[PDB]
Symmetry: C2
Subunit: 529 residues, 2 copies
Amino acid sequence: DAELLVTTRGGRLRGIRLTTPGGPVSAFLGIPFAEPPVGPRRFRPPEPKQPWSGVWDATTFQNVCYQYVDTLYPGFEGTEMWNPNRNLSEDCLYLNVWTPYPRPKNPAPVMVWIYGGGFYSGSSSLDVYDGRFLVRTERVVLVSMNYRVGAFGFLALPGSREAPGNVGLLDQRLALQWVQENIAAFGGDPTSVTLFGESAGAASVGMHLLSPPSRGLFHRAILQSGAPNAPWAYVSREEARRRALQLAKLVGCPPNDTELVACLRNRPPQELVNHEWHVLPQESVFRFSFVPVVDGDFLPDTPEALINNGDFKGLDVLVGVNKDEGSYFLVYGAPGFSKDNESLISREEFLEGVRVGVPQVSDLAAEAIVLHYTDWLHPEDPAKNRDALSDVVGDHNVICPVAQFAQRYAANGARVYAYVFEHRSSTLPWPEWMGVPHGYEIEFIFGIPLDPSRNYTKEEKIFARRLMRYWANFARTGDPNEPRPQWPPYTADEQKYVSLDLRPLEVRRGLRAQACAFWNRFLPKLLSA
Amino acid sequence: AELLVTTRGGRLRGIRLTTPGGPVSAFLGIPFAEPPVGPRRFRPPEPKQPWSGVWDATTFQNVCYQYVDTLYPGFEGTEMWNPNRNLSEDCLYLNVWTPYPRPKNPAPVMVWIYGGGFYSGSSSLDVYDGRFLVRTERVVLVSMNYRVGAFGFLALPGSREAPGNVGLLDQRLALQWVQENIAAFGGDPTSVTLFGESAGAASVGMHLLSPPSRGLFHRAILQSGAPNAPWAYVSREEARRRALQLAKLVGCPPNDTELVACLRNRPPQELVNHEWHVLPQESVFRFSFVPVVDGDFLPDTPEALINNGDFKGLDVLVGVNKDEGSYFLVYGAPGFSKDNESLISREEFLEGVRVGVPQVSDLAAEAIVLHYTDWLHPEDPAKNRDALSDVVGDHNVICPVAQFAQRYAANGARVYAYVFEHRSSTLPWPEWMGVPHGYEIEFIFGIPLDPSRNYTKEEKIFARRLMRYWANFARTGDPNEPPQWPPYTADEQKYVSLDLRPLEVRRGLRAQACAFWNRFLPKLLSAT
């Protein structure tokens, strides 16, 4: 029990010793940081956890936020590894701290992880977010939190104090405040807190960078396969009101804001979850019903606006994407697409999938996309058509928003390091044609290959330690390099970025510059006319 | 004799010309039409009535009244295209070159239609000298003057006083004269290969698309032009707008009968002096009086016609030069000039797009800028310079020829395609301009064989291959004889480069670029 009993503001905690081949770590799981956002507190901001008295057992993970369970491929590891692995509940606002045993002599750098899941899903408890290996290897203190999702975390009737929007992000913020007030007791350094996250976790990290009351709560950021300025990452006041009303309709509520929210509040959570997807405007991929909302408080303006107008001198940021960001999403409703075969689509299906992958744009905009993503010597090649829709969805949802994010952060004074991740896990359950899909760098960052119970290769263990080292070097100093092949900063002029895989770092220039010119310069002029 | 030949119009006398390969008999200045003068200005041409006696044909005749280029006075690069004989409306003469002695058997015939944007040109230019091609390949060559400018293409559609397209009818009539007479010069009326460059190529295409030109030739060769090019033709409404503007510029009052009457009484120089100023904007690669879509010579727009398959499926050989656009840019694009590297600024690139692609929406300019920027390096002057040269040359020459070649191949025609990449040793234009529009002609015409000129040993060898390619196409429809030049097909799109090195096969003529101009851009324009 040495170093397993720790006192925090809320009270005494009991942790548990976790083991790794490189030695032990002290974990404190299921630490409450808010009063449960239950009953009358549904859709409300979170309130700090009142002091429990005595000793709170922190040896197990806690309930996961009520959320949709993916059923596309029941039993498949490639999807189920993202599904909840604990009982579902609204009583879900708990966080986790892993620290080395013994705790370092000197206050150690803190990494704070924010999971993705399109703001509709996720949990800090997934096998793939296990913090033991980063902590043991790099002697970092690591935190993660559950945050509400779906309607529970992002349904908004903007203007109301009863459903103001963005409460899932406020969940994250309150966790960050808990860290400032408490990680020292775990050996963590509150003056060196690096947020990192993936997809929606990465968009969440973007928003903390831009939300004024979050900015004194961390120092450096990392955004993996996501940006706050992506077309799926946020929604206007009006569109969030329309979707809220539509869920209220779908769960049986009659057709002011007070009585509407009261009705939402008396329905059971399963019922909210049952209807979530049908509030969207068209069948589509890469869109999610309840996402942050531009409320004029947490986000004083659109992310595009706030990034353009922001000063970022002496902020260090690290961002990137995987080689094949679009592929995963295509099996969720693009015709001709499956995990179970090479998904060699026809041309008609390609033409169709453009309207799913990029929903709610003019037929003229579709015409423009089709033009850009067609090899005009070989427009009928099924393979080329499959890969091109992948690029369309990849570029539009992940790569181009990250490229703009990066150009703008450098321009407005940030040191930026940027990567593309190009190693396909030896153990990957998805077929060859999906390439290095979205989400599949995370297990290398978290050092899962070091798990003896799993079956990665010698080289994959070496590669994970490189990545953990880059990420932890960034966290310590804002620079992922040490004396002894350099990762150079991304500037707006040269646009350097690096490929990460088994081979050494290779420096390249320009994250799909031609294609992102299309999404970022031209297409907004077309729609706007 | 050898030089006294009888034709339907009467007897001619020609002149023996000498080459290093031996002699040729050339008959220059043969009238094929009544002078299109006075009440005949703007009118269809009428066949030349039999003259009596012997018409001396040893001498090139007058050139159609036309604008004289004054951009760079005395520069061989511009002056070689300028008129080299006295100007006149009495300019409807054609020229025949045949071997000395004549061929034992009926020879293939090649008929040349000069370019010049339909505003300029003449058969008498040094560079269209037929003597080397005739000698070297035992081919009979014809070229005609045809009316340019307002004289050949001003139209008040509907009227019989100025119906449109008379420059083209001049060409048709010449082709008819070839049917009726090249036998007398040793040529074979059943093997007439039509070829031309720029506007001349567009012209050739218009004849392939025009029912009334139907049994007048058997194969065709379009160099650096296509009838479906956006400079090549104009609508009735636009032609009418422009003929009215010309009338106003020459002082006529603002009933087609009276307007043309007034246009007829002004002198030709007065028409030429106001010619550029009828164009809707300041631009490059636009010409004022061009073919009009009349429902007669052109039943419809050339686009509609090829897209519909309305054409003679003749064998064709078509191609372009490596830097089609560069020449035109010095004619009004800011920052351009033959006297430096023309390292334009980016603001100069953006204005340049409006000049090079005139009269399109703001949004369409945006789409062009998008496609023709390297976005890694949008500030490099060299790249911006070369990129505007691609914009201009793709829109006006290359993509129209590609669409022309796709549509011809899809409807069963044998199509050969080339990109010509040899920059002449003697080229007066700066490097930067690369291998510009027009600078393949000297090679096709075998000019390097002229001992008084300064071409390389390799250049003469090159020239012989090209005349060989062209002339094998003339005889057979196929330029090869026992490395292949393969047919261009709509699936594979194979074409060859032509320079010093042997043929290298390649695929798709700027396919990505031309998809922008041929598929995307029209859908955008018609949503505004």
